[PDB]
Amino acid sequence: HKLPAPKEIRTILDQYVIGQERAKKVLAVAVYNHYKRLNQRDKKDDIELGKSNILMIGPTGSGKTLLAETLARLLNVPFTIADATTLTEAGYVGEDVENIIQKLLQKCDYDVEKAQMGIVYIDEIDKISRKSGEGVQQALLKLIEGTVASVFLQVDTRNILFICGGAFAGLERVIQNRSARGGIGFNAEVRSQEMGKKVGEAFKEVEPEDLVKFGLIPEFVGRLPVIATLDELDEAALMQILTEPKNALTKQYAKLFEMEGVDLEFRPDALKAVARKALERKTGARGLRSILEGILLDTMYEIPSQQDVSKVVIDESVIDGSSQPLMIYEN
Amino acid sequence: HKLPAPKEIRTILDQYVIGQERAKKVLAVAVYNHYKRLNQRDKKDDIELGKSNILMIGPTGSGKTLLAETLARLLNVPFTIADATTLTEAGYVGEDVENIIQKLLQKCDYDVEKAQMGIVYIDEIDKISRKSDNPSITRDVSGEGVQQALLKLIEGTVASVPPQGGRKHPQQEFLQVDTRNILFICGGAFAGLERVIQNRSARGGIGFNAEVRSQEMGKKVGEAFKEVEPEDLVKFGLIPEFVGRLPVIATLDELDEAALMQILTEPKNALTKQYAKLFEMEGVDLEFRPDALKAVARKALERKTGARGLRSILEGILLDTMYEIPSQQDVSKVVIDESVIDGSSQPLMIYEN
Amino acid sequence: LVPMVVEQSARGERAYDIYSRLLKERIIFLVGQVEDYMANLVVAQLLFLEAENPEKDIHLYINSPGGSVTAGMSIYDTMQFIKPNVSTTCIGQACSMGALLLAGGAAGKRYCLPHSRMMIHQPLGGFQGQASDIEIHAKEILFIKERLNQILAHHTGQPLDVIARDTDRDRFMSGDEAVKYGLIDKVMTQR
Amino acid sequence: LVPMVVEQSARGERAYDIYSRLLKERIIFLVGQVEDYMANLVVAQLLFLEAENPEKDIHLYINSPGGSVTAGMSIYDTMQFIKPNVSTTCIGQACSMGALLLAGGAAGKRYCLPHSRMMIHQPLGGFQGQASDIEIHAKEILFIKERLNQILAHHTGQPLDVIARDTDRDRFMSGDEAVKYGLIDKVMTQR
């Protein structure tokens, strides 16, 4: 187990994720404790501490998987990313709940040594919400308790850190109900029309009660002493991400034009406007794709029509939707 | 073979479709850049080649299915039209979510690699839409359950589709076929979305300085999807995370006056000509006067049933004539006029003698 | 007493008063002397029907002996401002203010019963004060009298000189006489 | 009688009077003489709408021949104190307090129907007693006259010397004249 200090964990992870450093701080120390504490408890006085499971709650395209991947990028121990929809009744109607342990057998390399420190992670856990449904939750909760169960190869379930993260739909509305409203007076603080519209109501402050109200099994809801809070996005972080990945959207756009032999010249100024379009559609980092894909459609239907189109210059007017691609066609 | 430009593909689509240039170019551009991905497999930091799955939407009779029909006959890669209604969650007795992949294999000779290159269109996507914006207490397995089941494939996964034989074997070495290479185009008529966007865009208030709008009307169908945004899709019932998976959103203007006057004859397969071809076998000619065409065009509008309505109009007019010609021989031709279409007149019958 | 009525819609049974039941059908009633309170209700109803259906045609029955000029202007200006056509059907009597609203209806949608009476008169006002105040108020009432004549001339189509002449004294007109004058378009006799 | 209206919300059907239904859309009605009881209703309505949506604008229709100065000030002071912009639409008459409340609306949100009439005059008062008491009350009515003129100047932009000159006697102003004067911003004619 890597087990670095919280400082190292956050700093080494920041390299690949921008904007999620707030939640990182919490998760950093969280996982740090779990490995260290359990591995070398040394029969601590009045041992009560339960597995330091951390919850993950963020909307779609919030970088849940990215934070899960970066967390598992340097972690030598296995991570065995799994799903909650794939799970069904225990080999009655479909897939059994032992498939999560089966994904661990692949990552652990059939090594009990690796199995015991397996960081079982799940994604989109919010699709089993009670309304199979609640049955999968209970059959899932059984393993969360740390009940040794083979898939066949015996697997150590004790000390398995759970960083499961779901894109809970309707989470803010439930925590919005808990929030109080303003009064009606001349010396009263009406704070807003609504309360979960300025900041993410869900990922600022959460208590186990709020999760139970959502419609989840109370035992599982009160099974994780720690929690997290993912920030949807940031305006500053949206311009950096535009060209941060190895095959970033803008990069790939130019690479696609380069296949024909055209350069995709782009202006810094245009970038700012682009961020606003994504912030308005409110579809996450992935959302930005649609904005430029449509904008480039004209350029993806002009460059082919005219050959020998050396490059294409995009200005702030083009992202505003008034200007037409400035073809730089020449000799 | 030579990665046809967007113009080189739209040319064939224009042969039949009349006015769907927005969608035709969207597919042309997508198809164009898609082909490059197959050839751009070099590990030169140009491998990601992410795909923005399109979600074709618009009123009925807007040539949505038609596009796939014509595109299926052009694409050099195996193209398979699909439906989101029949395939259901594997757990519950019924067809399985993976069977559609097998359909591509059937027309691809089970060459998984070649299959991967193919495309996957899914018409009738408005059906799977969640019962309500918020899930109901009764699981909608024939709905959002299938939506999530297919979602992972859209993101990218592998499918263990079986081979053509080998039943004896317990799992018969289920063929592994990639999904990230198989582009996805979601088609569908979003009946009711117009009201959603109508209120989302502006909620008619009251007062002199308000934004009072028609309570309920089916007159705004025309270009009713040119302001649709992912939020409105969610209201309709398309699960938010599912919406994000498909960034591009196409729009199909209901119809135009020129397209209705042109569609009767202009397209390769023209309703008028269809009856004329049948009339030829009978031994009569079908002369449609130019005014006749404009008359039928108008008639189609009241039905508000799409281009399909045109067929009904001609069949109604050409009912007594088609019932008489066989029993009433010596008919050289049957001239048509605008009055005939209107109904005031009866189709002019011609006789060589 | 106002009798109650049941709609018996598909959704279920809901009880509406005789006046509210007709309001759903784009009908508004103008009865009694025109005043700020009753006139304000008509305005509220007109605005409500506009939002409900801005394309349907509203119907306004008028049986009133007149009233406040300011109150009438609020109704007339409201009818012309909104997009829906406001039909008028005079029942009983229609004095100066009632006649203005009747004439202010949408063209071709003005009606009156066979035994209806329509009278057009000049504005009646009263005020007490010093000579300076009297001179100011006299100009105001004379201004209003000119505007009302222009309104009737616009809808009826008669020249302004004829309106001022016929409004000097009380002039009663029957249904047939009103059609020739231009105050209305058709006289409803039977279904 | 006040008619009933059905909202027919998604959750279920509800029945609201014509006035309550419009109140849901941030609309307040000022009808009749201004007095403490009716003025208190407006204040309560303004505060309630503020809590529902402190960002959405509010529309205050004013049809009144004036009234108590104190009651009017409670409304004017409340309109400015709250965050939402309280629009104003004259629907036919504002004599003393109606124009102060029509000209005390957010900039760019003061309207008037085509045939509305707006007046402005100095506050009238009545009191009897000893000479010492008369002198005390005389100063009070003179102080109020100055504070009221200052309010009009602020919202209209005209100098105080002009307001005092125009408020000595009754001055009637039409819709077009009021725009140039500064009392209102736009004259609503059609939708």
Ligand SMILES: Nc1ncnc2c1ncn2[C@@H]1O[C@H](COP(=O)(O)OP(=O)(O)OP(=O)(O)O)[C@@H](O)[C@H]1O
């Ligand atoms: N925090 C982030 N930093 C940089 N890129 C991000 C971030 N979050 C999302 N993205 C972008 O989103 C794309 C991948 O989306 P992904 O499939 O990870 O969504 P997701 O966050 O896993 O959805 P969900 O939260 O529902 O699991 C990548 O192109 C990536 O650039």
Ligand SMILES: Nc1ncnc2c1ncn2[C@@H]1O[C@H](COP(=O)(O)OP(=O)(O)OP(=O)(O)O)[C@@H](O)[C@H]1O
């Ligand atoms: N733009 C068009 N040009 C030519 N023919 C058309 C056009 N639109 C519709 N049609 C005709 O309508 C039929 C195809 O209907 P279409 O595919 O438009 O329905 P759809 O929108 O797919 O319905 P649904 O959304 O319910 O699947 C064909 O017979 C075709 O001739």
Ligand SMILES: [Mg+2]
């Ligand atoms: Mg992801």
Ligand SMILES: [Mg+2]
């Ligand atoms: Mg079809």
